[PDB]
Amino acid sequence: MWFGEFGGQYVPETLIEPLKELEKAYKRFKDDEEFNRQLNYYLKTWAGRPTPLYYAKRLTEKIGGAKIYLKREDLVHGGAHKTNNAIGQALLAKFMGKTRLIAETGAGQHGVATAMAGALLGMKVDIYMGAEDVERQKMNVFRMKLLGANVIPVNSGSRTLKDAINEALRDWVATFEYTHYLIGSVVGPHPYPTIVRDFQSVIGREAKAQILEAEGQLPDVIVACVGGGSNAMGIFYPFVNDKKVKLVGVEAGGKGLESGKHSASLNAGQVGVFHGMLSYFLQDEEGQIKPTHSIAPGLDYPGVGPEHAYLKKIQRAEYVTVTDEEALKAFHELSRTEGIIPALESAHAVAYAMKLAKEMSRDEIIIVNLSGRGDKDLDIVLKVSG
Amino acid sequence: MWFGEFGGQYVPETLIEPLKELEKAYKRFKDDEEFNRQLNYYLKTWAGRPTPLYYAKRLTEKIGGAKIYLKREDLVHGGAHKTNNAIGQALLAKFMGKTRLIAETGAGQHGVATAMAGALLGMKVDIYMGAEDVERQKMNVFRMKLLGANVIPVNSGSRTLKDAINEALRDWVATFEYTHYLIGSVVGPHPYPTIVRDFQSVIGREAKAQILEAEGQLPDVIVACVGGGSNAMGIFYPFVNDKKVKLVGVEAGGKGLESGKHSASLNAGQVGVFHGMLSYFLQDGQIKPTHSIAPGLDYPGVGPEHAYLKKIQRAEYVTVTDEEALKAFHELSRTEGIIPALESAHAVAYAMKLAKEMSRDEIIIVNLSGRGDKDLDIVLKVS
Ligand SMILES: C[C@@H](c1c[nH]c2ccccc12)[C@H](N)C(=O)O
Ligand code: NA
Ligand code: NA
């Protein structure tokens, strides 16, 4: 439940029974033979795992420093690492005898991944999405509708991701006998931060076997962008006990930390309690969630998962920021140099990796988690770049 | 060079030297260890091969006949099977000392694949595209530019694929000493139909091993959509000598064969010379306009090896309309959580019809040539 002092189940009594039922169900099925056979089967045949580990030779030789490897989660079905968590939880839901999935979404990518997994498993899917986000993400909403899901606009509060989460939680109180609430990052009340991290750990376990194969040793640095923190946890977690391996999470620096338009919860936020968890959040002086910004829509959650707050506190991982402008340059650079169009979220990790590689030697090794592909972002980049 | 009465090498004398060079270099490198090391390395770590073979359990149970499997080329880097060929030829070009790739594109899909491979290998990429197609494919034009390629709008004539093909050919005549002409389908003068087919054959070799693993048997039918024919040949070719395996190519029926607005060169076209090859082309003997909702099926001809397989009755060729493809696009999305390319949706649609009339112990493999992300604008408008 806790990662040091972070985490918890900060919820109404009305949620304690669904959550206890979830943890009981998860404890049973996490190591169940049939559950893991079925999970691996869908990950392999439907999602396309394992994803490759790619040596960005041209990018590496251009910068002239450490070897830059990319964990290619951009090749997973759907175009983002989120699918690993969507399948895991949707199948867990099915094993629990649930016939409906609900989920929050802001950028729309979790909604699409949930919709995909619900379609795969023949479940009804209802997606809660703040009206501001429904407006900004027409194409992802359309994907969700194509995949058979209902998108429910959320008109309360700030009409955004934080409000979608709260409305989903209210649905779940009424409907948990037949509904599973599929949370999209390593956030929320226990047992979600653990479950989502466990379902994403496949990334780091594959990456570990692949770097040992390609290079004969562990990497010096693993770099991943941090929205809520699931892609980063997925790749960090199997290396947590490898003391040589440096872990770096990259948050959205937006227009710059001094501008106030960013979403760097760990670098600039403070401890708080929202959405059932004690963690770091960006808050106004009255202790309410403040507006956030990033060019990458998957990085604009005002909080971060408790397990990252923990890793930062104990100094196991370093957390840094990259600006909109730096992300955007790395988006173009990776496209031109390696023929891979990254997600704007992932481009943050690429931008930082490029800076870090320059100060390191040519025998040292960086793995960047390329969390997604950039097709979803082409409308944004066309407007802001040209 | 010849596939029965189809194929050949109908080019001006100036192009005979570069094509003989291409043939000799191909013969040299196709079985060369270093070439195959790099190729397999790029296919594995950059493109993500092997792609999986997926049992569409819900679609299979719902229709209630044959087992439907999908070869998931929608998961290759770029979202289309075209990447397999773009890497293969771009690597061939690099091994031949070429520094520049040119290509033709109508939908933008081959242009993007070529741009991707050229970026990977550090080669200049110029893509010829008819001005009308430029306007119709804004986002693919943007991808190509993001990847470092130049998109040359062709303003002559109708400003569409045929005008872009004529311009690329003129360019290749001038620049072949440092430029490789990267043809996007099993079409063109020898040796392109053989080369592209060999670079797509990996699809079929994987599929064969995967279905043997999954089911202990070969499929009863293999279904693939057919524009120029490369994804279909890629998946067909390793099964050509397995007599049991039926091979079904699906062409664009468009608004209906009767309507005159389709791209069904094998079913309704006539034999003749276009793009350096002798094959079926849609003609009046000038090139007639073509239509499909799936922009990748807009090519006015078809590869000579398909004309041959049709002639000897080794493969059957059918058509699916815009309407049937669109329904299968929605059906797959809803039923399996896979948004297919509109091109691949033609094969899905036909396989669904066919599965209904087959036994439940029988197996259909559909080549899911691509993903539908590129088609969401088109589908938003039409649906
Ligand atoms: C990043 C991701 C997301 C989905 N759910 C989240 C919860 C907390 C933090 C982030 C998320 C995004 N907003 C999406 O909906 O795709
Ligand atoms: Na955050
Ligand atoms: Na045709």
Exposed/middle/buried for residue A286 (C-beta within 10 Å: 0-12, 13-18, 19+)? exposed
Q: Can you give the C-alpha Rg of chain A in angstroms? A: 19
Contact A374, A381 (CB under 8 A): yes
CATH number of B241's domain: 3.40.50.1100
Nearest CA owner, ligand 1 atom 2: A298
Contact B354, B221 (CB under 8 A): yes
Reported in sequence order, the residue ranges of A190-276 that DSSP labels E, i.e. its strands, are 221-225, 246-254, 270-274
CA–CA distance, B206 with A283 (Å, rounded to integer): 53
Q: How far is CA A354 from CA A19, A224, A227, A236, A351, in A?
A: 42, 12, 20, 19, 5
Interface residues of chain A, partner chain B, Cβ below 8 Å: 44-46, 48, 51-55, 58, 72, 75, 77, 79, 115-120, 122, 139, 142-143, 146-148, 332, 335-341, 375-376, 378, 381-382
Last residue of a domain, one of A141, A167, A200: A200
Residues of chain B contacting A51 with CB distance shorter than 8 Å: 48
B216 with B97, same domain: the answer is no
Asked if the bond preceding A50 is cis, omega within 30° of 0, the reply is yes
* Strand order across the A2-3 sheet: A2-3, A6-7, A277-281, A270-274
B54 with B27, same domain: the answer is no
Ligand 1 within 6 A of CB of A228 = yes
B94 with B156, same domain: the answer is yes
CA–CA distance, B370 with B346 (Å, rounded to integer): 11
Question: Could you tell me which of B367, B248, B252 has the C-alpha nearest to residue B315?
Answer: B248
| Ligand 3 centre distance from Cα of residue A204 (Å) | 45
> In Å, how far is A119's CA from the nearest CA of chain B?
5
Task: Give the pairing of strands B67-72 and B53-55.
Answer: antiparallel
Nearest CA owner, ligand 1 atom 10: A228
B365 with B280, same domain: the answer is yes
Kindly state the tokens that stand for A108: 């729309």
DSSP letter at A43? I
Last residue of a domain, one of A151, A168, A200: A200
CA–CA distance, A167 with A157 (Å, rounded to integer): 10
Residue where the block lists tokens 């960013």: A262
Question: Could you tell me which of B170, B120, B129 has the C-alpha nearest to residue B148?
Answer: B120
A214 with A246, same domain: the answer is yes
Ligand 1 within 6 A of CB of A106 = yes
Q: Are B147 and A341 a contacting pair at CB < 8 A?
A: yes
Pick from B44, B147, B376: which is nearest to A52 by CB?
Answer: B44
> In Å, how far is A117's CA from the nearest CA of chain B?
6
Task: Give the pairing of strands A179-181 and A221-225.
Answer: unpaired
Q: Which residues contact B368 (CB under 8 A, 6 or more apart)?
A: B54, B70, B71, B72, B73, B74, B338, B340, B341, B344, B347, B348
Ligand 1, pocket-test mutation among A161, A181, A233, most atoms within 8 A of CB: A161
DSSP string computed for A108-168: SHHHHHHHHHHHHHT-EEEEEEEHHHHHHTHHHHHHHHHTT-EEEEE-STTSSHHHHHHHH
Q: Which residue in chain B is spatially nearest to A46 when comparing CA positions?
A: B54
Reported in sequence order, the residue ranges of chain B that DSSP labels E, i.e. its strands, are 2-3, 6-7, 53-55, 67-72, 100-105, 124-130, 150-154, 179-181, 221-225, 246-254, 270-274, 277-281, 315-321, 363-368
Can you state the angle between helices B33-42 and B82-95, rounded to 10 degrees?
140
Ligand 1 within 6 A of CB of A267 = no
Left if phi > 0, otherwise alpha if psi is -120 to 50, otherwise beta: which for A43? alpha
Pick from B116, B330, B376: which is nearest to A139 by CB?
Answer: B376
Exposed/middle/buried for residue B44 (C-beta within 10 Å: 0-12, 13-18, 19+)? middle
Contact A40, A199 (CB under 8 A): no
A265 with A328, same domain: the answer is yes
**Residue B155 dihedral angles phi and psi, to the nearest 5°:** -100, 0
B118 with B138, same domain: the answer is yes
Q: Which residue in chain A is spatially nearest to B119 when comparing CA positions?
A: A339
Can you give the resolution of this entry in Å? 1.8
Set B185, B263, B279, B369: catalytic member:
B369
- Rounding to the nearest 10 degrees, give the CA dihedral for residues B287, B293, B295, B296: -90
CA–CA distance, B284 with A116 (Å, rounded to integer): 45
Q: Which residue in chain B is spatially nearest to A43 when comparing CA positions?
A: B52
A379 with A329, same domain: the answer is yes
Computed from CA positions of residues B164, B193, B303, B340, in that sequence, does the dihedral angle turn out positive or negative? negative
Q: Which domain holds residue B266?
A: 48-81+201-383
B369 is catalytic: yes
DSSP letter at B138? H
Q: Are A335 and B79 a contacting pair at CB < 8 A?
A: no
Set B67, B71, B98, B104: catalytic member:
B104
CA–CA distance, A238 with A223 (Å, rounded to integer): 14
Can you state the angle between helices A82-95 and A16-29, rounded to 10 degrees?
100
Q: Are B147 and A52 a contacting pair at CB < 8 A?
A: no
Q: Are B334 and A48 a contacting pair at CB < 8 A?
A: no
Q: Which residue in chain A is spatially nearest to B374 when comparing CA positions?
A: A375
CA–CA distance, A119 with A99 (Å, rounded to integer): 11
DSSP string computed for B52-115: PEEE-HHHHHHHTSSEEEEEEGGGSTTSBTHHHHHHHHHHHHHHTT--EEEEEESSSHHHHHHH
A251 is catalytic: no
> In Å, how far is B357's CA from the nearest CA of chain A?
24
Count of domains in chain A? 2
Task: Give the pairing of strands A270-274 and A277-281.
Answer: antiparallel
Q: How far is CA A139 from CA A143, A145, A168, A223, in A?
A: 6, 10, 22, 29
- What's the farthest any 2 CA atoms get from each other in chain B? 57
B255 with B382, same domain: the answer is yes
B376 with B261, same domain: the answer is yes
B102 with B60, same domain: the answer is no
Task: Give the pairing of strands A246-254 and A317-323.
Answer: parallel
B14 with B76, same domain: the answer is no
Kindly state the tokens that stand for A289: 């969630």
**Residue A229 dihedral angles phi and psi, to the nearest 5°:** 115, 10
